[PDB]
């Protein structure tokens, strides 16, 4: 059918992800052409990801007031223009600014686009769709950095930003004629007063809040691994860059399987049972990683296999719990999705910083013990969330 709105949404989603995943490999080549210090290399990832955290709060509720089509389609244009605008950046400081202005194109995805995917499709169909397009998005973190490395040696790095606008221009025309309008509040007045009243209403909904936090706590052990596996494996266990990137394969490969299995089970199990089916690998895997590293302070393979089992349960559970939590409140979904994302951004910002200091004054055991209580929190929040 004409369900390419999922297909073209993930194309745009994938395009914003390679806007950072494929660029960091060449950031040393970037900062050398601009004749700037090597301390400007990490700030391009810092500027890009800080842009995604910027207009999350407004884009959602704005899309309720004037529609999910005009807001989303505008962000696709913003992404395309700022992708090409960086080719006029004459110095490194202009480059970093445009890195951040491109980064604002990411908060159109959660608050606006995926709100439409959830409102448009039925429960079991939408979970098959969100779980499978999540795998197509994971192609960017998995293959982006490796493709970005091959790109800079044969082609100019500036040609990546042309590639991003080209994929998003394909996505724009697809989204144009396919993206459904699901905003109920079209034509409403927008002021900071009413916008504040909207978020106070959703934070009163304890059931919604309990589910949005559970999405943050259960996904935090995965981000704590991404943010610190270079330090834990390489500088801590003295393993090669090959064997570090190799230990990412069983974890991120299990995440894809959890989505692939969830997708196939969408029609054969209730969303309540899919979350519980995913909850068993989540606690088992976190316990495998937690118990084995308290016994063996340097059992990094048990940690890798433990987090892989746990990563399999997330693919099974997430897309379902995302749906239930979103519709657990009668608020417009732009405001709800934005609230969900900010509640998760908060858990990840504060959470990762604790896990960094958890691994310092206490080895892999404390890093894995901190991961286990987050799984206990999720478990305890699901007991409150499911009845």
């Amino acid at each position, epitope marked *: 059918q*004409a369900l390419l709105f999922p297909l073209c949404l993930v194309l745009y989603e994938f395009s914003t992800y390679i806007g950072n995943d494929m660029i960091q490999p060449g950031m040393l080549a970037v900062v050398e052409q601009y004749q700037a210090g090597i301390d400007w290399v990490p700030t391009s990832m810092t500027a890009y990801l800080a842009g995604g955290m910027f207009l999350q709060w407004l884009l959602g509720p704005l899309s309720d007031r004037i529609g999910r089509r005009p807001v989303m389609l505008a962000g696709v244009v913003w992404f395309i223009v700022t992708c090409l605008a960086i080719l006029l950046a004459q110095n490194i400081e202009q480059f970093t600014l445009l890195r951040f202005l491109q980064g604002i194109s990411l908060c159109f995805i959660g608050a606006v686009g995926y709100a439409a995917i959830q409102e*448009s499709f039925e429960e079991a169909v939408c979970i098959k769709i969100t779980a499978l397009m999540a795998n197509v998005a994971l192609i960017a973190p998995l293959l982006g950095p490796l493709v970005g490395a091959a790109w800079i040696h044969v082609l100019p790095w500036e040609g990546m930003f042309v590639l991003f606008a080209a994929l998003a221009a394909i996505s724009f025309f697809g989204l144009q004629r*396919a993206m459904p309008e*699901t905003a*109920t509040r*079209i034509g409403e007045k927008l002021s900071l007063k009413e916008l504040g009243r909207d978020y106070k209403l959703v934070l009163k909904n304890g059931r919604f809040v309990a589910g949005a936090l559970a999405l943050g706590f259960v996904s935090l052990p995965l981000l704590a691994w991404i943010a610190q596996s270079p330090i834990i494996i390489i500088t801590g266990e003295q393993l090669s860059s090959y064997e570090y990137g190799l230990l990412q394969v069983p974890i991120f490969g299990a995440l894809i399987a959890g989505n692939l299995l969830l997708a196939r089970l969408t029609s054969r199990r209730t969303v309540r049972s899919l979350i519980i089916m995913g909850g068993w690998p989540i606690m088992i895997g976190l316990l495998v990683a937690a118990a084995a590293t308290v016994i063996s302070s340097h059992a990094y393979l048990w940690m890798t296999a433990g987090l892989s089992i746990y990563a399999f349960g997330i693919g099974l559970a997430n897309a379902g719990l995302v749906r239930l939590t979103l519709f657990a409140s*009668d608020m417009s979904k732009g405001t709800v999705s934005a609230a969900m994302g900010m509640l998760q951004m908060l858990i990840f910002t504060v959470g990762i910083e604790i896990s960094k200091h958890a691994w310092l004054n206490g080895g892999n055991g404390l890093f894995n013990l901190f991961n286990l209580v987050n799984g206990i929190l999720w478990l305890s929040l699901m007991v409150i969330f499911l009845k």
Partner: antibody
Amino acid sequence: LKESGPGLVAPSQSLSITCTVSGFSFSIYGLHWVRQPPGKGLEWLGMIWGGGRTDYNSALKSRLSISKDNSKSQVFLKMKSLQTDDTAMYYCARNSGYGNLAYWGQGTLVTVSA
Amino acid sequence: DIVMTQSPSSLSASLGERVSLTCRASQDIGYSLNWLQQEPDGTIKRLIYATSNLDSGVPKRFSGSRSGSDYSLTISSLESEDFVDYYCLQYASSPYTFGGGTKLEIKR
């Protein structure tokens, strides 16, 4: 919007009103069903959201069923176990870029007797 | 269900007169409200969406408003064609609900 209906049906039978949607943007905007009993004003029945997600009225959520046909560009209202109550003029409303129920259907007079 | 009681149930007035409708809500519906007129033959036409916004192609005499739970619709200078049925529609929470209507008649 043109809604083909049966016109006459019997109690404890099924009906099927098929509304054909004008415009290429068929699977973009949602579609509603509204009925008007001979005297008792207007009643909102249900809604389908373009991707198939259905939303029914709680009192009649028991017999209502709203489905689309991507090939023939039309939406159906299928209602089960009828009676005197459900004799009404059934309308086919449609969302738009300016909110809900911006364009309405002609209406088809469906009757339930013997 | 958010019940929507519409008043006056019926109303009569001569041409060029400023008259108003009103739908009170069972609970808070915000600004999510529509106004629909039904021509005598049955043609339903939407005039105002989201409390205040006139739809494209509607005479300037129409204008909707909100004051608390009470949402009104006023015609400044009534005309001959305006004497029809009028319903309001709430789309804040499912199921959407209509008002009790108001049928408009001419003069005295």
